[PDB]
C-alpha cells in the first residue's frame, strides 16, 4: 500500500508560536517540544524522478561525504 511512518520532531523551545496541538501541560521545557508521528503514503512523482536522473546520469559527481566507488 506504500505507506510508511512520517515522523516530525519539533524542538521549539523558545518559539513565540504558541503550542495548541496537545495543551497537556507539564511545567517544564517539555511544553515547547513535540514528537508528531503519522502514517502517510510515500510518493515520488515521475517529474521528481526525472530531475534526480538528470542529477545522477553524469555518473561522476557526489556530495562531500563518502568514498568514490563509481
Amino acid at each position: 500500500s506504500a505507506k510508511a511512518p512520517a515522523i516530525t520532531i519539533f524542538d521549539h523551545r523558545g518559539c513565540s508560536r504558541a503550542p495548541k496541538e496537545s495543551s497537556a501541560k507539564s511545567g517544564s521545557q517539555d511544553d515547547e517540544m513535540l514528537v508528531k508521528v503519522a502514517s502517510t503514503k510515500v510518493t515520488v512523482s515521475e517529474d521528481v524522478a526525472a530531475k534526480k536522473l538528470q542529477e545522477f546520469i553524469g555518473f561522476k559527481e557526489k556530495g562531500l561525504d563518502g568514498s568514490v566507488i563509481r
Binding site: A2, A4, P5, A6, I7, T8, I9, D11, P19, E21, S22, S23, A24, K25, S26, S28, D30, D31, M33, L34, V35, K36, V37, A38, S39, T40, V42, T43, V44, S45, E46, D47, V48, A49, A50, K52, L53, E55, F56, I57, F59, K60, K62, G63, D65, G66, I69, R70
Partner: protein, 174 residues
C-alpha cells in the same frame, strides 16, 4: 506503544508533547538523545535517499541502461520511493526502540516481492548500505558546536542500534 499502535498500522496523526513527552522519555532508553538521533535522520531524509540511490547507480550504471531495473521515470520513482519507505520504517524503529513494526510491516514478504519483480538484490544491498552509512554518520555527528544542532556528547550506542536495524533490512531483502 499503543498510542503509536493505531498510527503505524487510518489517516489521522498522533501528537506527543507535554507531560506525555516527559514520560515517554522516561520509558525509552536515552529519550533526549534518541529524539535528536531520529530528528537528524528524518530531517536529512531526502539527501539520504537521493545520495544512496545515486551511489547505487554510479557504482553500477547499467541500472539505468535500457535493460536496467531503474530505467524510465516510473521505475526510478519506485526505487526512490522504496528507499524512502525503508528509511522511514528504520527511523520508526529507532523512535520506538525495537524492530517489531519494521519486520512485521516492512520487511515481511519483501524478499519474495523483489524476487518476483526482478528487483536486483545487489543494488538494493548497496542502496540500503549507503543509507546505513549516512544514518550512522548523522547520529555520531562529529562536527563543531556552532555547526551541531544538539549538545555534544556520545551517541555510539544509538548509532550501533540504528546500524542493527539497517542490518535487519539487508539480511531480510537479499
Amino acid at each position: 506503544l499503543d498510542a503509536f499502535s493505531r498510527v503505524v498500522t487510518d489517516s489521522k496523526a498522533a501528537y506527543v508533547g507535554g507531560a506525555d513527552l516527559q514520560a515517554l522519555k522516561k520509558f525509552i532508553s536515552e529519550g533526549n538523545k534518541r529524539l535528536d538521533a531520529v530528528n537528524s535522520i528524518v530531517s536529512n531524509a531526502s539527501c539520504i535517499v537521493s545520495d544512496a540511490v545515486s551511489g547505487m547507480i554510479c557504482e553500477n550504471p547499467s541500472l539505468i541502461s535500457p535493460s536496467g531495473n531503474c530505467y524510465t521515470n516510473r521505475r526510478m520513482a519506485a526505487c526512490l520511493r522504496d528507499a524512502e519507505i525503508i528509511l522511514r520504517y528504520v527511523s520508526y524503529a529507532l523512535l520506538s526502540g525495537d524492530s517489531s513494526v519494521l519486520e512485521d510491516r516492512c520487511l515481511n514478504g519483501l524478499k519474495e516481492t523483489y524476487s518476483s519483480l526482478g528487483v536486483p538484490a545487489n543494488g538494493n544491498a548497496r542502496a540500503v548500505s549507503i543509507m546505513k552509512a549516512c544514518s550512522v554518520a548523522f547520529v555520531n555527528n562529529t562536527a563543531s558546536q556552532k555547526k551541531l544542532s544538539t549538545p555534544q556528547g556520545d551517541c555510539s550506542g544509538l548509532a550501533s542500534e540504528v546500524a542493527g536495524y539497517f542490518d535487519k533490512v539487508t539480511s531480510a531483502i537479499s
